[model samples]
Target: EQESVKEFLAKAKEEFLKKWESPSQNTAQLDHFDRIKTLGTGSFGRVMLVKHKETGNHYAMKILDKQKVVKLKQIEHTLNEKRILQAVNFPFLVKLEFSFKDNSNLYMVMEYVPGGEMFSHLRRIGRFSEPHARFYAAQIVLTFEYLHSLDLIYRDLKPENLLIDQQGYIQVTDFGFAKRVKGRTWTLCGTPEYLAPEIILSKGYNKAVDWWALGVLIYEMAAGYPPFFADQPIQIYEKIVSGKVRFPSHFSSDLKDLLRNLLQVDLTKRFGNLKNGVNDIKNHKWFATTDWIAIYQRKVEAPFIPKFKGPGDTSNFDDYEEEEIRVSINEKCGKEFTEF
Candidate 1:
């Protein structure tokens, strides 16, 4: 028997709060968990597959180098990511169980989605069919919708960051570039291909930019590459500012029309930026038949579900060796990261 979404969400929130409120159960101690293996790594730090010693729960633990974070001037963005993860818990969004820090590192223990990234799966099949694209896009729409509801802008969105959970649904990860903008922000961030024209033009932007990225992602999923195919950022920027999308001959007319609306350079004419806002995108002819509520409940069967054995499966991710280096944060730098 299923329960109401409102009740399901409330129950999840309450369960998470119980963990958050009980500090003793949610310690900042790395020794509390068994570090299994490295899942992936970036400039900041490495993400490890960790199993909590007490509860035996599997988690993805992101270990960040405090020294590098402060030196790269990513302190604010890093904290921004942490705060947003702490702010909400949703079915389609990755959940941050808790976060703790040491003098040299910051550990973020997050729910581990064993299905890996959508990028790997997308590449395996070359390109997604219309059904597949819409299946993935529908979930993303709600994820972005939820973020916008909280005055947040998830600036970075792509196949790599969109992970699939074991249940065959999206679990979006990475919020470093996300912001809680009250009005508009002028920050020049996000991937070149996914960056909206307004962002490339150095104009003030808000959640509308996310809508543009959704279009790019849909196009990429369907056509196998971003609409603006370029060898460099400047080339991509030029293509984006021109405000034209070249549809593959195989694409349907309705899908093409949807892309044109989303890829539009004129913010005044964009779908999400319009008065109807995200509803226009949701109610597009292409998605008219979709039961959005069913999609949210994961009741709508996904076009593809990954093959995984258990919660701690790492086969879905690439093999990366964990580094043994740990540098202490300077006393002054430590003050900057006091929030973490």
Candidate 2:
């Protein structure tokens, strides 16, 4: 099995190199380094916190398995993810620096966010107040608005994929599950708890999937759990498809009405139309007293900002496994090296 793994990795490396050799010209060269500490691990691949040797700037390097991607027939999805991220330069979304292929891994270098996952904070606090939840939700709404303006829909919007950046603002990450809508319905792929009714029912969906996810995020933030919960995945799917949303009764009527509209099953009447979905929720009575301008400017003051002592501080958060990260320098390449 070890030998087989090595052989597979070798072949994957060759494939990746073949694509990296010729970029059709006019592509900015990427400066990468040896592996550093493991940031996180996922089913597809693992992320490493790497730093550019000359620049001394840190970045999260995502390594994708080339062979696994081909086997899963996710080449298009992978390309789409890169394209969407590259096109979107918004502060709320993660920044994709550049992409390249080494031997076996398709590498993506992205801006490194210091604060940990938003899910960790949610779990730590157990639940959030309505105003606090609205703040985060509003940020997500702005993100989706910008994405939709470009005809892209981020299918996955969960706490696990969100992070707080160095400046203590919410940043959305993970684009592997995202796709560009060109009038063709795609397969349903996302967290079951965040999946919309139409997506779960085998019915066609569009950008509205994001609105449903926003509702799910809001409910989870306020209730400390997903609104649709069941023992099995199938049971959860059934509940979501049924479009039966039950409020906790303790929630304000204004919030209840917002969730009902957001989780509405009908695509035509969902979220008060596409462009107005976010505005409708933002203008709801629950958030009527919220200072919209201050929220956007991050001036109203956040209820919680991850306590950090420095740029690389991890004391206030969880820590992952550490690894030996080496900086490789190509001395013979004849390029001048300068400190960042």
Candidate 3:
């Protein structure tokens, strides 16, 4: 009996490691794709809309500068993003097709989501009706449930990180802060408005943090802004830790109840953090009309469909100044880091 148990444990460890292995090297060269435009930019790197020269297929290419990543000590984080993208297979999550590294930068080729960021839509539309908010929230619920099942915690859950695919469904992107955590993690990460009280207090947190962020997100969608808003970062933290939430007079009791349950300061009593887990959130009155199975299967029609010229549309994305193209190889770092 002891030998059988040991054998099973060893096999499970081996399989888990295999699935989480770094992405393959020797990927398609940068020249193999034609750059359309810059999709988005940040301090560390930028994402570009690119098309496969041979197949004419579109993809979002994430380009990261090696020097910038190393300076920020994000080598592990960058590699982890690649690993998670490779390991996770879900329709609602962004898919990584290929990865490669040049002399000075790392490239991640991912499925192109042309509907653009949910942030833009949210800003343009002001706020969503209850049913509209419910549609998007339902999809995000499934995404969080999937990530938690894999023991992965998505520290960042915001409108900016949520992209709308051509199918008008939510595609959660940007796994830079995502980590596979078991019991708890002590990292002080994630956006200010969405930060959980545990994270703000430097108390170790697990998957419950995501639930808290989800509650914030739902409120933002319904109210046109986050539940807690202060000009200064300190004031925001104060509001978060105090656990005081003010709902607009127009918000329904059902929505208020769901938010209160999700935003519960005690992790044990938090909606999704309870023994019932995600079912607690799914079964709440706010989501009573939601057909979770249909949502997962994407049978529920989206609240909005973006207008596009074709598969290569860039109208929805904001324009940015052209970036200078350069590649420099650091022999020392290049030798130490081989995974793209």
Highest TM-score model number: 3
**Model 1 per-residue lDDT tens digits across residues 274-295:** 8877779888999987898899
The segments of candidate 3 whose C-alpha lies over 4 angstroms from its true place after superposition are 1-18, 21-23, 329-332
Kindly list the per-residue Cα lDDT of model 2 for residues 103-181, writing each as its tens digit: 3446678888888888888998988888888888878876776666555778889998998876667988889878767
The ten-residue window of minimal lDDT in model 3 covers 4-13
How would you encode candidate 3's per-residue C-alpha lDDT over 21-116 as one tens digit per residue?
644566688999888898889888999999999999999999998888888878878887888887777668998888888777888899988888
Residue 328 local lDDT, model 2: 38
lDDT of 1: 0.83
- What TM-score number comes out for model 1? 0.90
Tell me how many residue pairs clash in candidate 1. Answer: 0
Alpha-carbon lDDT of model 2: 0.72
Q: What residue runs in model 2 are displaced by over 4 Å at the alpha carbon?
A: 1-31, 272-277, 315-340
**Best-to-worst ranking by TM-score:** 3, 1, 2
Q: What number of backbone clashes does candidate 3 have, counting pairs of residues 3 or more apart or in separate chains?
A: 0
Arranged by lDDT with the best first, the candidates are 3, 1, 2
lDDT of 3 at 174: 94
